Design a protein around this ligand. Structure first.
Ligand SMILES: CNc1nc(Cl)nc2c(C)n[nH]c12
Length: 164
């Protein structure tokens, strides 16, 4: 069912995460972690303190899809482990230094064609698939986007609700 999902999304904040490769989204699903550039790390740390739930909605660049979404379970922390991120051009391990802990709510894909009807007021009402890494998605757009994903029956939202 969708009732516990809707409870988790209640009053959440939503952020578009753009990853330059699949390997790091795969690593994030396996390890329950995410790292981003400092400008976005600052925004997510602020949001984490301000909202009952901060949801990261993931999209690998050029995949034409979202790869799932997750809830921040911590602010960023340094020095816990050297997450073997696969680094593309220009990006280095010091920039991706802060690690957030995340609980996955859905590890299933959603193609961009399925969200064509959702626009993001905080990005000039462009289609929600359009946005830079770290772009905030307004509550109603973000809620409807998350509800479009296929249910992920491997995930029990009970423990997530307790983190709140
Ligand atoms: C592990 N975090 C990340 N990994 C890769 Cl390949 N790209 C990005 C971007 C564009 N923001 N955060 C990223």
């Amino acid at each position: 069912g969708t009732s516990k999902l809707k409870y988790v999304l209640q009053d959440a904040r939503f952020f578009l995460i753009k990853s330059n490769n699949h390997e790091n989204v795969s690593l994030a699903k396996a390890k329950g972690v995410w790292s981003t550039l400092p400008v976005n790390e600052k925004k997510l740390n602020l949001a984490f303190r301000s909202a009952r739930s901060v949801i990261l909605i993931f999209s690998v660049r050029e995949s034409g899809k979202f790869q799932g979404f997750a809830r921040l379970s911590s602010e960023s922390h340094h020095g816990g482990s050297p997450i073997h991120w696969v680094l593309p051009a220009g990006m280095s391990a010091k920039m991706l230094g802060g690690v957030f802990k995340i609980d996955w709510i859905c590890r299933r894909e959603l193609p961009f064609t399925k969200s064509a009807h959702l626009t993001n007021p905080w990005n000039e009402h462009k289609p929600v698939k359009i946005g830079r890494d770290g772009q905030e998605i307004e509550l109603e757009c973000g809620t409807q986007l998350c509800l479009l994903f296929p249910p992920d029956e491997s995930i029990d939202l009970y423990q997530v609700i307790h983190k709140m």
